[PDB]
Amino acid sequence: GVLKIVKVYLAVKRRIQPGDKMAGRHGNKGVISKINPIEDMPYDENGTPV
Amino acid sequence: EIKELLKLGDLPTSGQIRLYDGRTGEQFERPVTVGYMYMLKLNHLVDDKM
Amino acid sequence: VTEFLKPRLVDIEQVSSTHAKVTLEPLERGFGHTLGNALRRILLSSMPGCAVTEVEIDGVLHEYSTKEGVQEDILEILLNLKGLAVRVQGKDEVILTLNKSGIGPVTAADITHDGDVEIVKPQHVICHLTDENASISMRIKVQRGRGYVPASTRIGRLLVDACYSPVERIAYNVEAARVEQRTDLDKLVIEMETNGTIDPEEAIRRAATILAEQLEAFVDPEFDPILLRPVDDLELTVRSANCLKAEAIHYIGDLVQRTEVELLKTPNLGKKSLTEIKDVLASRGLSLGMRLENWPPA
Amino acid sequence: TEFLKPRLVDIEQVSSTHAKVTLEPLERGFGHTLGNALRRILLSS
Amino acid sequence: IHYIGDLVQRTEVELLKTPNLGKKSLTEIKDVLASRGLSLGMRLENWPP
Amino acid sequence: GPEEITADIPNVGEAALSKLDESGIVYIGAEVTGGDILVGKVTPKGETQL
């Protein structure tokens, strides 16, 4: 019954956003709640932000 | 041994450092532990689930 | 009624080509952190800089492709191009050409020397050509902008995530200033770690300029829409479109006003073209010699 | 290159000597910047 | 015609006047050019700098 | 009757058909977004008097 079949392979890249789920190897898991700009981030004395 | 590696690293032995709030500039009233943790992004992404 | 002491750039200690220490000589106590945070906040996000936004590599169509004779795939190449530090004279868009054949690393030094464009780090690796019959030819578009504008913020041409901000890291110290006068004065020492695209002093004056400009005081349907569509929406032949545009007909509204007589009087429009135009216009309920009276409103 | 500058204002007079004035448009990171700058000036200068 | 710029200058008529390009091929060219926002008979006036 | 994969689709503009080849299948390298056509296909109408 089938005349022709077409398969189209599409590829997408996804950047981390609010709502994505991240975790560590120790059972510490959680969802991203906020993406705050670099200047608002807590930083070390030498200016390096976390 | 971690204390030793922190000593070549130049410490704090506890692993807590003074941290400045990016919005104010005021230091947080207590020393805060900061370090590189290995974190994974899980297969659950908002884009798929919403 | 004690007049205030106003800050002035007094020192520049270039630790390196991309690391500096700018200090302000006069400050009243408690003003160190205010300017420190204001300036760090402006610098870390509101600085203007050049960044690669598009790339056109030969033989490559999509960024997921890999090229014959190149070690790393196109993605890695673009990812390398994100880190291309460029200083452009006086332009908001520049095209760089990169032609390179041979074996070994293809660095930013192999990019065709343009008079305006200044390359901060010529030893910055963009590629690695393996065999001696391999060669790459690409066109890197560099633009001026602000903040982080991803490629997802929308031809066989690739797009690259734009990292416009020239500043990587900022730090500041309040440190008590000397001087016998007043004694209770401080000096703001800003340790800056930029990409070398912009000089420390102008960055400071630009952050302050932005801040000052922000502080600018405290005060206190009729007719058919189809007529304003471009002629390209009619999907005519290239010839007819170019002819119409040459006759100052850029929109459908302009076309529907013209008559057959007037159109045939043009230097480039034959009977075939007119037949086509009448056909495509009739196909959408339109025609020539249409009166809409009031061209145009606003 | 131009930035978004304030437009449209509002003043909520909670009382005769207590008010709330707000600036409608600002770029991100400027809320805490002008907020802390102004709070630091107002609370001491 | 070695480059896209060379192709976009030619018109359908002229290409059909060439010894080796038929209408199937020309249609193909129109499709692939349309797929990239390009076309035949494109004027760039100043070829080349 | 047979369903056909074709570039000819009822009431579709060239803008929508821009990224489709002669056959009716999108050309490799094209950027597609939600709603865009990947493969053009027509099915015989059961037909109804309008």
Curated annotation (Swiss-Prot), chain B:
The RNAP catalytic core consists of 2 alpha, 1 beta, 1 beta' and 1 omega subunit. When a sigma factor is associated with the core the holoenzyme is formed, which can initiate transcription. The rRNA transcription and antitermination complex (rrnTAC) consists of RNAP, NusA, NusB, NusE (rpsJ), NusG, SubB, ribosomal protein S4, DNA and precursor rRNA; S4 is more flexible than other subunits. In pull-down experiments interacts with CedA. (Microbial infection) Interacts (via flap domain) with Escherichia phage lambda antitermination protein Q; this interaction renders bacterial RNAP resistant to transcription pausing and allows it to read through termination signals. Belongs to the RNA polymerase beta chain family. DNA-dependent RNA polymerase (RNAP) catalyzes the transcription of DNA into RNA using the four ribonucleoside triphosphates as substrates. Resistance to the antibiotics salinamide A, salinamide B, rifampicin, streptolydigin, CBR703, myxopyronin, and lipiarmycin can result from mutations in this protein. This is DNA-directed RNA polymerase subunit beta. The modification N6-acetyllysine is found at K7. Acetylated on several lysine residues in the presence of glucose. The gene is rpoB. Co-administration of salinamide and rifampicin or salinamide and myxopyronin suppresses the emergence of resistance to both antibiotics. It comes from the Bacteria.
UniProtKB/Swiss-Prot annotation, chain D:
It comes from the Bacteria. (Microbial infection) ADP-ribosylated on both alpha subunits by the phage T4 protein ModA. ADP-ribosylated on only one of the alpha subunits by the phage T4 protein Alt. The N-terminal domain is essential for RNAP assembly and basal transcription, whereas the C-terminal domain is involved in interaction with transcriptional regulators (such as CRP) and with upstream promoter elements. Belongs to the RNA polymerase alpha chain family. Homodimer. The RNAP catalytic core consists of 2 alpha, 1 beta, 1 beta' and 1 omega subunit. When a sigma factor is associated with the core the holoenzyme is formed, which can initiate transcription. Both the N- and C-terminus interact with different regions of transcriptional regulator CRP. The rRNA transcription and antitermination complex (rrnTAC) consists of RNAP, NusA, NusB, NusE (rpsJ), NusG, SubB, ribosomal protein S4, DNA and precursor rRNA; S4 is more flexible than other subunits. DNA-dependent RNA polymerase (RNAP) catalyzes the transcription of DNA into RNA using the four ribonucleoside triphosphates as substrates. This subunit plays an important role in subunit assembly since its dimerization is the first step in the sequential assembly of subunits to form the holoenzyme. This is DNA-directed RNA polymerase subunit alpha. It comes from Escherichia coli (strain K12). The gene is rpoA. The chain holds residues 6 to 50 of 329 of the full protein.
Swiss-Prot record, chain E:
Signal peptide: none annotated. The modification N6-acetyllysine is found at K23, K24. Residues 1-49 are annotated as: Alpha C-terminal domain (alpha-CTD). DNA-dependent RNA polymerase (RNAP) catalyzes the transcription of DNA into RNA using the four ribonucleoside triphosphates as substrates. This subunit plays an important role in subunit assembly since its dimerization is the first step in the sequential assembly of subunits to form the holoenzyme. Part of the processive rRNA transcription and antitermination complex (rrnTAC). The complex forms an RNA-chaperone ring around the RNA exit tunnel of RNAP. It supports rapid transcription and antitermination of rRNA operons, cotranscriptional rRNA folding, and annealing of distal rRNA regions to allow correct ribosome biogenesis. Homodimer. The RNAP catalytic core consists of 2 alpha, 1 beta, 1 beta' and 1 omega subunit. When a sigma factor is associated with the core the holoenzyme is formed, which can initiate transcription. Both the N- and C-terminus interact with different regions of transcriptional regulator CRP. The rRNA transcription and antitermination complex (rrnTAC) consists of RNAP, NusA, NusB, NusE (rpsJ), NusG, SubB, ribosomal protein S4, DNA and precursor rRNA; S4 is more flexible than other subunits. The N-terminal domain is essential for RNAP assembly and basal transcription, whereas the C-terminal domain is involved in interaction with transcriptional regulators (such as CRP) and with upstream promoter elements. This is DNA-directed RNA polymerase subunit alpha. It comes from Escherichia coli (strain K12). The chain holds residues 275 to 323 of 329 of the full protein.
